[model samples]
Target: HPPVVLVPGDLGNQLEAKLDKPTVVHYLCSKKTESYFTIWLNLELLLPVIIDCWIDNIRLVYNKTSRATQFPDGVDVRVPGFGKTFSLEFLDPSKSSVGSYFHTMVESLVGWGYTRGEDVRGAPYDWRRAPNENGPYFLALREMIEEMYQLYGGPVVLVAHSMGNMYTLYFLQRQPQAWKDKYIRAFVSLGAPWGGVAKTLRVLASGDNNRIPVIGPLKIREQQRSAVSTSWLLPYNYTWSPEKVFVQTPTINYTLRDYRKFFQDIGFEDGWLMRQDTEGLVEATMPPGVQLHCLYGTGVPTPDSFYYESFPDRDPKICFGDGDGTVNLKSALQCQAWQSRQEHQVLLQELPGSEHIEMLANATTLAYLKRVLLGP
Candidate 1:
């Protein structure tokens, strides 16, 4: 174990580069697939109203950090710089050209005051061919963790966003017994979809054209059958399904043919796809006793100097409920250990006027991280 900090890349590079710097003293950046199709689509749809507000909040933090100072007592003090520099390992096993998009997105996030460290660029997405093996992505992560531990000599805090959080959970669960003692202080999961995605289920059920090579058509058929087998597309499995399992919204339609097509083309539906192209494993394997903190965004009530009508009843299970529009509050807060009381966990922090992509930049969210990661 090491006093290391691990930042998982979600839809965007916001948390991976920005939060990883100035906050944690030393860390490692695990690069997963950047072209997270479904997530990108979700962000694109919500961009008009939420992205700008989220960017403004992040800009404010940058401005505040610019004016902040450190005391000169040789004691560890919180300064307003991006977190520390660390190694960057790309986790795309598919070897698709998507890594370029990921890198481009990282640049955009950095332009907004985030900082991406050195890149350990590689194509390791094909590790699933040999299932028993640790796989390339896991191996790379383990190597980085060992290196960081050798250098820093303590447990590392894991700060993950969206799908990255799921990957972290999956990694931890796979080796729970061996890695438990190497546990860090906390895990901050930002807008994670731990539960199955209703949209994904819908798309598979729609008989959408498959754009992937080889097993594309078969994968779609399998997914469709799986969806039916689990009865997942019926809205009951989704917290925000129109059927009222959680939230209800006219704008929310479970039909995701185009969305599913996009993810499938990017290898997300392939069982052999490695690196960042997998889905829904986090809910199955999160290690017990891990401290968890969840954050989400709600684009209601507008922003300062604006008045928007509130959505009826801020229930955690509703569509566009108390989330960043992509993840519902209940899904974001769902965890096995939390139900059992085996570990400490925080309720979802709904970022007002923010959407999924912009949540990382929300001021309140950043403030909370400042308190938790940097402390009082």
Candidate 2:
């Protein structure tokens, strides 16, 4: 069996936050010293009043001067488990009562008699920033894969999901082809957003509750907009044409070329700035030098475009298209472009009815992974 390294999607790991802020966003918000608490998927933070604080805590602050992004002042955050699987197994450290992110997948591998940090491992990262801001993480990731290769005396397969696939592609592109050939056996991507997602534009325009109930899109809109990762995931030109209208309004129909005006009209000039800084980090058209095995869902209704009746910043009436309910169909299928372009082999497998997140634990996906990681 090949050694496997699991990479999780955005906000997929448990993040612990230590607050030493100068001030609070609201009176109900914390002001002073506090122990590190689970912040990323902490269910307690989504309460009526506490969500405001969570938004403030989770959102990034873009410093135009340095063209850099920062976590809120006085908030120190860290992802637990660098080479371990604890943080990757669950978003909330409390338990699966809130729901598991990679728990089932890791457990399935464990059932195969693989040790958590031995033959199978997790590569957790701070998913808030884009690739440019993740130079340190990429270096660490490269070193980890090499270390795993040395330890196992075999090449390692990169198993990534959703935004993790995008980030992994960026990491793989930066490494030397010789290094990849020596260290990487295969790159297995699940629910990859290769050419970016149309849903991110909606997140920027309004906000997505991210399937969490009671917490409205407006509550998390500011935080979602603050993340450069959100802008990085915007539909790219490779998959979407300039003439394609993504956000339509009575006043103006916004196309890919209209991003600047769209941001300006929505009163978030920082979004356009962040998009400029982050969008080019991952070139989807460029293939990862390693052998690629891409799998994604199909036939689900995903948001292709948004119709805003009055305001661009308001909730939208989404127009559905084929996808995995998160990634647009064409975007997820962008891996197909690599088939004849790269020297390495590219294999694509589609899970017909699987939703993006559900594919993490979808039986067919799991069976396919078992074949890839183990044997047919």
Q: For all candidates, what are the clash counts?
A: 17, 0
Q: How close to the true structure is residue 64 of candidate 1, measured as C-alpha lDDT?
A: 22
Superposed Cα deviation of residue 279, candidate 1 (Å) = 8.1
Candidates' lDDT values, in order?
0.39, 0.86
lDDT, residue 202, model 1: 28
Q: Write model 1 residue lDDT over 206-304, tens digit each, in one string.
A: 332233222233333333332211222122233333333221234332122233433353343331122122323333434445676766656542111
Stretches of model 2 off by over 4 angstroms after superposition: none
**Clashing residue pairs for model 2:** none
Candidate 2: tens digits of C-alpha lDDT, residues 263-321:
89888999899999978887766789889999989989999999999675568898999
Off by over 4 Å in 1: 1-134, 201-280, 283-288, 299-322, 336-341, 344-348
